[PDB]
């Protein structure tokens, strides 16, 4: 029964790990969206027929 | 009959031994419970992802 109590202690560490990885995943989704937008902006800025004001 | 009286003297020593061992057993049960709790605490403290404040 001592071992079963120890497993009761293990579950808390696993739950904390779950929470940490969830936060990381949310931030990562936001970052991927921003990276797509940045790629579009960089593609638009590479046009050679633009004014000095659009660049 | 002298021997029977002597046995009457023996029974008291046996009863005192009973009492002493009973006290020891009660203390031992408490100690085993505390040892289980200590094992759980030591297992929890070995997690490498804890803060300086939880340790």
Distance in Å, alpha carbon of B36 to nearest chain A alpha carbon: 5
Q: After which residues is chain B discontinuous, taking C to N > 2.5 Å?
A: none
How far, in Å, CA of A39 to CA of B27, rounded? 72
8 A C-beta contact, residue A5 and residue B36: yes
> Among B40, B43, B45, B42, which Cα is nearest to B55's?
B45
* Structure determined by: cryo-EM
Residues of A in contact with B39 (CB under 8 A): 2, 5-6
Instruction: Give the phi and the psi of residue A48 in degrees, each rounded to 5.
Output: -85, -10
| Resolution of the structure in the document, Å | 3.2
Q: Is A47 left (phi over 0), alpha (psi -120 to 50) or beta?
A: beta
Q: What letter does residue A51 receive in the DSSP assignment?
A: -
């Amino acid at each position: 029964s001592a071992t079963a109590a120890s497993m009761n202690a293990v579950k808390d560490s696993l739950q904390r790990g779950q929470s940490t990885i969830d936060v990381a995943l949310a931030a990562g989704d936001t970052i991927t969206d921003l990276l797509g937008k940045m790629k579009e902006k960089a593609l638009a800025a590479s046009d050679c027929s633009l004014n000095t004001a659009s660049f």
